[PDB]
Amino acid sequence: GSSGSSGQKKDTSNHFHVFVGDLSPEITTEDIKAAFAPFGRISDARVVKDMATGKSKGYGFVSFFNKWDAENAIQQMGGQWLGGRQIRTNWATRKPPAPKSTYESNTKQSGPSSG
């Protein structure tokens, strides 16, 4: 914090982030914004990349000023074709599943027999 305050500063406090996947390797941070562009003014938009090489991971993030703007997209944008391939839109922030596993296999057989 330098001497003095720049002004109206905010860090996506009351913003809604959106999840985007199935994005072609040729898609750039811009491309994404262009998709949700007409779906509401986008603030935070970027394309996840590998911190090891720096290559397009595949999924990206898109935050909107309002909740509707995003939601609307998550539905419409979801299942659409961006750039040159489909895309998976959903809520970036979700709750983890509960610990529970089960499995069953009804064999109902003694053994194979032929001639």
Curated annotation (Swiss-Prot):
It is found in: Nucleus; Cytoplasm; Cytoplasm, Stress granule. Phosphorylatedby FASTK; phosphorylation occurs after FAS ligation in FAS-mediated apoptosis and before DNA fragmentation. Residues 16-94 form the RRM domain. Disruption phenotype: 50% lethality between embryonic day 16.5 and 3 weeks of age. Surviving mice appear normal and live for around 2 years. Increased production of TNF in macrophages after stimulation with lipopolysaccharides (LPS). Increased susceptibility to LPS-induced endotoxic shock. RNA-binding protein involved in the regulation of alternative pre-RNA splicing and mRNA translation by binding to uridine-rich (U-rich) RNA sequences. Binds to U-rich sequences immediately downstream from a 5' splice sites in a uridine-rich small nuclear ribonucleoprotein (U snRNP)-dependent fashion, thereby modulating alternative pre-RNA splicing. Preferably binds to the U-rich IAS1 sequence in a U1 snRNP-dependent manner; this binding is optimal if a 5' splice site is adjacent to IAS1. The RNA recognition motif domains RRM 2 and RRM 3 are necessary and sufficient for binding to uridine-rich target pre-mRNA. Homooligomer; homooligomerization is induced by Zn(2+). Interacts with FASTK; the interactions leads to its phosphorylation. Interacts (via RRM1 and the C-terminal glutamine-rich (Q) sequence) with SNRPC/U1-C (via N-terminus); thereby facilitating spliceosomal U1 snRNP recruitment to 5' splice sites. This is Cytotoxic granule associated RNA binding protein TIA1. It comes from Mus musculus.
